[PDB]
Amino acid sequence: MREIVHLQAGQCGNQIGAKFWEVISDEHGIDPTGAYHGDSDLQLERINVYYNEATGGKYVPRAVLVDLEPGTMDSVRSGPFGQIFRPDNFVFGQSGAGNNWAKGHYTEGAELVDSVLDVVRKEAESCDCLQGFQLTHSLGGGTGSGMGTLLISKIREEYPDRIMNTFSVVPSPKVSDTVVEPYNATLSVHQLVENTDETYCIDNEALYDICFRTLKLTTPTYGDLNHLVSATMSGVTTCLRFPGQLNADLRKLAVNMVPFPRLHFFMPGFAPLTSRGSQQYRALTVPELTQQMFDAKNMMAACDPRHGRYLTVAAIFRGRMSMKEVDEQMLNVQNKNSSYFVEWIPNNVKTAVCDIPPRGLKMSATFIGNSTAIQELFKRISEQFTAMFRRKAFLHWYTGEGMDEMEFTEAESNMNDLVSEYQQYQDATA
Amino acid sequence: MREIVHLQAGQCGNQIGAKFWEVISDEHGIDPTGAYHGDSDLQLERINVYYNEATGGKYVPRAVLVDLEPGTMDSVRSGPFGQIFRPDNFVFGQSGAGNNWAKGHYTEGAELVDSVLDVVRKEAESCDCLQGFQLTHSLGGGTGSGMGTLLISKIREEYPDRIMNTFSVVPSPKVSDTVVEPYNATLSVHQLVENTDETYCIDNEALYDICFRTLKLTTPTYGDLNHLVSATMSGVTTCLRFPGQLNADLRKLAVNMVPFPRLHFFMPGFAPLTSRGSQQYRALTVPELTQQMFDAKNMMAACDPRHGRYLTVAAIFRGRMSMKEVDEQMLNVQNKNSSYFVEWIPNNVKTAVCDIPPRGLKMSATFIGNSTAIQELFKRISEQFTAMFRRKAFLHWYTGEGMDEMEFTEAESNMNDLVSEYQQYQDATA
Amino acid sequence: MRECISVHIGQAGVQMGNACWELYCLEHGIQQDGIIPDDSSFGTFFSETGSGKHVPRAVFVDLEQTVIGEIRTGHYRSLFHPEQLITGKEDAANNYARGHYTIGKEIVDSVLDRVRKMADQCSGLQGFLIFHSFGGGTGSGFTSLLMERLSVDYGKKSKLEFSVYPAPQISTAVVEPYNSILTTHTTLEHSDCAFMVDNEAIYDICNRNLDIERPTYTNLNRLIGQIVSSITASLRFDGALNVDLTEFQTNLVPYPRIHFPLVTYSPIISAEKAYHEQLSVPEITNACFEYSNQMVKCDPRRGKYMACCLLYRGDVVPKDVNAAIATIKTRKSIQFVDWCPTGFKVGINYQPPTAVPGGDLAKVQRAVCMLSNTTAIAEAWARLDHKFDLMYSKRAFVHWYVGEGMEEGEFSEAREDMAALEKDYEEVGTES
Amino acid sequence: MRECISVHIGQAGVQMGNACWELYCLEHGIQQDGIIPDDSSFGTFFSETGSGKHVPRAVFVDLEQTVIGEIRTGHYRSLFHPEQLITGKEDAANNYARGHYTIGKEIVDSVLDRVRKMADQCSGLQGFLIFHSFGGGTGSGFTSLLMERLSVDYGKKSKLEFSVYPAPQISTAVVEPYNSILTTHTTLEHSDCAFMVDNEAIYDICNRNLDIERPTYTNLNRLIGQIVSSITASLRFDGALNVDLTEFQTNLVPYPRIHFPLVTYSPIISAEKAYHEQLSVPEITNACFEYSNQMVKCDPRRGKYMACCLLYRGDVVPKDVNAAIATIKTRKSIQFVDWCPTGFKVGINYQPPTAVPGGDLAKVQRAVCMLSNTTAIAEAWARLDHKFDLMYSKRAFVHWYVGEGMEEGEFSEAREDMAALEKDYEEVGTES
Ligand SMILES: Nc1nc2c(ncn2[C@@H]2O[C@H](COP(=O)(O)OP(=O)(O)OP(=O)(O)O)[C@@H](O)[C@H]2O)c(=O)[nH]1
Ligand SMILES: Nc1nc2c(ncn2[C@@H]2O[C@H](COP(=O)(O)OP(=O)(O)OP(=O)(O)O)[C@@H](O)[C@H]2O)c(=O)[nH]1
Ligand SMILES: Nc1nc2c(ncn2[C@@H]2O[C@H](COP(=O)(O)OP(=O)(O)O)[C@@H](O)[C@H]2O)c(=O)[nH]1
């Protein structure tokens, strides 16, 4: 029961997804061939959350891999843990999106989404109790931004009551990987604010600082970054898969983390994160884990929480700990930083403690934050969008696929409303 | 409880600091790798004063090593007991101060002090009961004089009620290691008289006499001098770390040694100090230890106490002794040398006896003296400063970094006030 | 002859149940199963079968299936009846509406059936012991749904409930004020007496007297387990002055809407420091009325006592109890309300408290559990109501509750009822 | 039936307490723990538990945690109740203000609680024995803070205190005159009788009669331990003429503000030289009134006696005491005040003094402790006041005291009170 169906999209999503299943399979003891060789029996009790069983002990991920080009999937199946996936779930086209939201959404993915849903429904109908859908993509491209948002709309229209959570890689402020990021991002956000319950925003620039400052990693590959993203993805779905003192279902987080419907954008974090040479200088106890979780330099999003206030916060601990330490430390953070927390919410921390930690770590903790400071990200995108849109920078590529300038204005207006809404609820009562 | 946080600064401070931790680790049984291999259990009871515990028995010094250049720290970590420090505490820049107080304080360290405080606060917040801060630096340079005084101001503004003690290497009268010593010293003193509770003044020239006269050392390296300084640094913080008949906390010394707020400059000493060939001609008993402690030829400061009077004096004994001998000997010194002691203070000696002596010595004793004769040091500096300042000797280097000639006059005026104050309280009642 | 039906709802109640049934099994000599190796004592909580298997008279219910599944895999797997362990499909997501309106409607008809099958098997029904959390989810919604069903099918039969009241400062969920008030509104007229405990208070006790700096939830549950054993000791064991479950109602409830006694357990003492203590009756009895030892973080001296039940155990002489209570009555600091000259209910039982192996409590000779109804608790309700007003002024999380069967009108009705309850506490606190 | 609550404050009192409780354990046959291997004597100082553990009726308090931590690690680690040993975070730094205003405010409420828990456990309360230093820090500030609390909660109950008075010449701290006067001001109206001892005087005794040239603080404490045992011997043991703690008040205190008796212990004799001494009652009694044997460096012949309490021990014949005191009365050098024709209080106890193993005192058959209230002590107060005037004229260290809760007005009030006390001593020293 409480099954999760994973849905890939684009190059970024597939790359992260491949790493995600490498991590998930590791903690569940699944070999790359699909066989189970774990030690503990607790990792096999709730294996149905992510995997479907087959004859001979083969466990198949409940994952759908989709992209408009064959290359990224071909890399996925060739790489480690690539044969674990079911071949029928590789729903791909031939002519890719050129990093334009219009093509992936209206022109290219429109003729392929119907096939994708034929695999999503088949996976969904095989669940004893469907909990939600898990989507990994990027907002800065065409396929993930365009095609991913198209699937979100289709599923939310077909499964209204199931929780939809997205792990989106957000464009960075410092430098870009694509000239048309503002167009792709603004249009994609127009669909997320309406058809998802919790989106975990992450930017590559922030992850570079984590590798540079904390991990002291001098040659950070994209595989290294995907490991950090995979860690937080696994953390938010541990209470479904392992026992714990105080459990926290995905919906249990949404209620505690989403006061108003549209303020559901989170910036994640993880701990412990230390370099190889500095590991022998750490106590590795609850007091210090909570000390760095709330640090602005350990969050995988660019926005600094110091520039705004936290509406809500979640700390999903893993490993055997003293619940007194967790409750006291969370309260201690609340008291010291009372200026950083919205006052009309008396308690701003949701605590979850899972008994089984990740492999190789005695203790671990994942940080989730719904902060009013995230409006900085959206407002920065709006400034970039209006500058390009003010003189029709690239619309002929988008309008050539069927879009209209009216849609761009609607997307911009909705983004401004969201930024304003975040500012409204940043002020005290009366 | 009663933790002390050690803060290095400049080449002189780091050099002395490295020797300091070699001595401290020795008496606490800590190996250079951080492991404990001592015999007695008393040296592990109060180890939290200087060290933080880590997994596997690793004990990490609560020390922050900072300098504007990487070289001195690179030498520290490469030398013995260099790996014991936590790497994160090496807060250093790239472009060093050129021995000008302005650059280290206003221009170069101003952009680095914020990072240093991020480590000081983290260390401080990990203490069960913070007692004070320990700073080792030199007044004759830029980094120690400039950057060190900047940290003193920041910490005293952030921890008003904690005791700040500094171990400063003072310029010598006979010869100089730097042409701009009067500028660096006078400006540095302007900050110490206001933002520290007890400064232990020491000059290299005095330590050369100790090595030449008493120790009969013919090849005195700077490591040899740092051992003498380390010995007195350890002595003033033994009652916090080991039991004794009559304890003396750092604050316990300040109250007994600081009658008025600004007369808190001390000249330290140590005993026993004998050569290798003259050791078999000494009784090594309390009566003779006290005999050389008050000798003007055994104090690590240039100022002769015979030229003024002692406001207060402290004798921190170590090792098992007869308290009768200590009380009688201290009284005997008081009676014989009544001309050397301020009369409006009925008792001018504070006695502390710790049970555990330093390694290799059955008995030991540290001398601390607040004497009105220390005005000779300050007045000598003032004469050097005014001669250079009378015709703008080097101000363009200091004024080029942002300083003003008004600040130099203020620093000189404050120094003259301190010298005058020492003279006022050198006269009897009415 | 006597019996008690124990319903454990939610994670807190279920996890507390494991501590309780690990202790009942110990006190009665059971072997972690239904087997007693080669008696009218165990009959109160355990039903017997011809095979020698003693079956707990309890129902474990949770919409979430993680915690109850752990029981099915733990050491007590073979103890409970498989149908007693009822598990749902999806949890309440810390939402009162889900537990009461959407999901609870698909499990209440099943749990009530097993209550029906248990009630008719008893020679004589005595009451209910309900364990649940006040924070929210199944402990707020489902409990109210089940409590109202019991009040109809079983009417005047006693219905006692043990609740983990929200702490003043510590909090583990963001919408506890919503859930706490909603369950309170729908349980005042269906509950006879609710005993309160706080996580924060027991953390202090576990660190102030028990010398443990790392309390888990297991430690707290064992402390709670002792309290319930002290309450139900009279039925299980013989004593000098027995007290029944139906006696708590008229003794601690002066008015129908004020039925929230506090809880206390005096000899919470470490094994090492017990060697330097006499642990006589007067000192343990005096310890109950100290703020430092209350299981709920509400200072008794902020208000006036109106009912106290002292449940002693072990080698206790009634003469000592008489003198010990009298001196307490003399103290002017311990102020009872004017209209209750008769303020103490005394229960003495011969069976001493049994220490769970691997626990922290010492091998105490005599223990006392105090159940005090005090006006000071009104301040705690005021604090809880204040939190609700702030969030509800902005409609902080109403869209979740309204979207799962509930209506906006319930928030106004629920809070207005609590305002009356706070006013009712003011009336009782004044005389003439 | 009788009892005494011993509070040991500061390093001096705590370290003196170790000597005292090492001797009480010896005299009562205890084995360095609460265990007596296979009686109404030990009940005065030790509480008993069913396990056979005898718990000291003492409270060890110190803002510093070094000295009390040593007790927790020493041979008597298992003796004291763990909660009796109360340790603070930071010391008083030899400052009266810190002990009384800043730090003492965070520990007094805790120590007074254990005094409350001890007082109510006694069959009958007799008084308090407070050990502290006069030099300063916790012994000056915290003692005054605690003494005033006792005077309110326990009122007329006896409150005796033992103080290490500052020496005339020897001194270990620079601000003793400030602390000594400040504690004296706040303890005159809350103390019934304070017994004085000086480090310098006992050093002379330990080197003038005991043939030891290397006295430590351990040696002095053992000498002090004997004195307290002699004072409390009547309660512990049977005797011919018993003296109670409440008797010292009216016998040695003629006026409320003059309650500072001196202390003396006659047979302080080495083992070797004891073989050449008769040690009869007349010679030991005569030794008390010699300046060379006083425990406080104040010459008795500089003033007039006004009250003397002779507490004998061992094989002592009351006829010898009667004659021995009478001949002393005859001597014209030993001048009593005119208004006290009745100047001697005699107490004889059968229990001889027990020699601590590893000590220096001989195995004396009979010992006498003299508690003499003499006008000569006024000179010592005058010397102490003179030191205060010099430092205060320059405001030598006032900024420390003023910066930690105290005010400048207290220095003027404190010294003015002492000036009255010195004047009061002059009035009592004159007749007609
Ligand atoms: N005393 C005690 N309280 C607990 C324990 N476990 C959980 N709680 C309390 O339960 C409160 C929240 O309600 P839960 O029991 O965790 O949630 P639930 O009843 O399982 O309902 P769901 O949200 O659907 O899972 C928390 O605030 C805790 O204080 C426990 O073992 N002992
Ligand atoms: N007889 C005796 N006197 C002692 C002993 N230890 C300390 N003293 C006296 O205590 C006086 C000073 O007070 P302390 O007890 O040292 O200080 P404190 O009471 O611990 O208060 P703080 O300053 O806060 O530490 C000194 O002048 C000593 O004469 C001891 O072991 N025996
Ligand atoms: N971590 C990670 N990020 C990626 C990877 N590939 C692309 N991205 C990010 O995705 C964005 C580019 O969009 P992309 O997904 O390539 O366009 P799409 O193929 O149409 O979805 C940039 O912000 C990249 O940082 C990858 O393998 N790993």
Ligand SMILES: Nc1nc2c(ncn2[C@@H]2O[C@H](COP(=O)(O)OP(=O)(O)O)[C@@H](O)[C@H]2O)c(=O)[nH]1
């Ligand atoms: N003992 C010792 N003293 C030093 C050392 N290096 C410099 N000093 C002293 O430091 C003073 C010079 O200031 P310096 O620290 O070099 O300037 P800075 O680098 O700006 O702090 C002189 O008085 C030197 O005697 C060293 O390695 N050992």
Ligand SMILES: [Mg+2]
């Ligand atoms: Mg649950």
Ligand SMILES: [Mg+2]
């Ligand atoms: Mg002390």
